[PDB]
Amino acid sequence: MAPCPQDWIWHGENCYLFSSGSFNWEKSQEKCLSLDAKLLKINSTADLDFIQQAISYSSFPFWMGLSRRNPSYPWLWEDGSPLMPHLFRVRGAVSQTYPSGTCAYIQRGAVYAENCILAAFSICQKKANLRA
Amino acid sequence: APCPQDWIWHGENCYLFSSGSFNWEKSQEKCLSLDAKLLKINSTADLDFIQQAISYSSFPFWMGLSRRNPSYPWLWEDGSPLMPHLFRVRGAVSQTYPSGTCAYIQRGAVYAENCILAAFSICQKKANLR
Structure with a gap:
C-alpha cells in the first residue's frame, strides 16, 4: 500500500531519500521540509548501521x-532532542x-x-506510511 | 508494500544495491538468491534513474x-537484445576475455x-501494486 514515495529507501518506520544537490546545512534542512521531511536523525546504532551501509559505497x-x-x-x-550517548563520537x-x-x-x-x-549532500527522513 | 525494506521502489520495479563486490557470475547469483535479476535498462528514464541513485x-x-x-x-x-538509443557502451x-x-x-x-x-551490482524485481 506504499509505505513511501518512489525513489525513497524504506527502513523500519522511516524512509530515506538522498540529497540531490550539495548545499549548506540550512538549504539542506529546507529541502527536506519541502519534501515533507526532516534531516537524518540517528536514534539507535541499528540506525547508524543502516545509514553507513547505505552510503558505504x-x-x-x-x-x-x-x-x-x-x-x-x-x-x-x-526537533530539539539531545544526542543520545554511545551512538558515535563527533x-x-x-x-x-562560526556565524x-x-x-x-x-x-x-x-x-x-x-x-x-x-x-555537502544530506539525507532526509519521514515516518513511513503504514496505513493501507 | 510495493517493495521490501532497504530497496528503492521505482516505477514498476524495486531496486537494491549490492553489498559485496564480486564478479558478474557471482553477482548475478546474489540477485537470484533475492528473487530478482541484474539491472535491466529499458529506457533512458531508467538510466537517468540509476545514474542519480549512484551519483554519490x-x-x-x-x-x-x-x-x-x-x-x-x-x-x-532474460536474453533480450539491447534497445538502440539508450546508451553506448x-x-x-x-x-x-575467457x-x-x-x-x-x-x-x-x-x-x-x-x-x-x-564490482557492486544492482538488482531488480517487479514491484507490487496490482
Whole structure:
C-alpha cells in the first residue's frame, strides 16, 4: 500500500531519500521540509548501521539534523532532542564558533562537525506510511 | 508494500544495491538468491534513474548485459537484445576475455569489462501494486 514515495529507501518506520544537490546545512534542512521531511536523525546504532551501509559505497559528506551554535551549546537534533550517548563520537572542528554555527555530517563511516555554510549532500527522513 | 525494506521502489520495479563486490557470475547469483535479476535498462528514464541513485559513488556497478566476444551482440539476462538509443557502451570492446565480457555503469557512463572482475551490482524485481 506504499509505505513511501518512489525513489525513497524504506527502513523500519522511516524512509530515506538522498540529497540531490550539495548545499549548506540550512538549504539542506529546507529541502527536506519541502519534501515533507526532516534531516537524518540517528536514534539507535541499528540506525547508524543502516545509514553507513547505505552510503558505504560512497565517500562524500552527508548532512544530518545535528548542530549547535558553539561548544557552550550541546549537540541537538532539529526537533530539539539531545544526542543520545554511545551512538558515535563527533569529530572534526569541535572547538570553534562560526556565524552560521556548527553542523554534524557523516562521511566514509564517521561523524564530523563543520561550518554549516559549507556545501555537502544530506539525507532526509519521514515516518513511513503504514496505513493501507 | 510495493517493495521490501532497504530497496528503492521505482516505477514498476524495486531496486537494491549490492553489498559485496564480486564478479558478474557471482553477482548475478546474489540477485537470484533475492528473487530478482541484474539491472535491466529499458529506457533512458531508467538510466537517468540509476545514474542519480549512484551519483554519490564512484565504484563500478554491474547490470545484466554481457557477451562472449564482439561477434555476439549485447544481451540482457532474460536474453533480450539491447534497445538502440539508450546508451553506448564505452570501454574495452576490442578485447575478448575467457569468462565473457560484461557491462557495468560507473560515474554516469556504461563500460565493458572482463566479467571476472569484482564490482557492486544492482538488482531488480517487479514491484507490487496490482
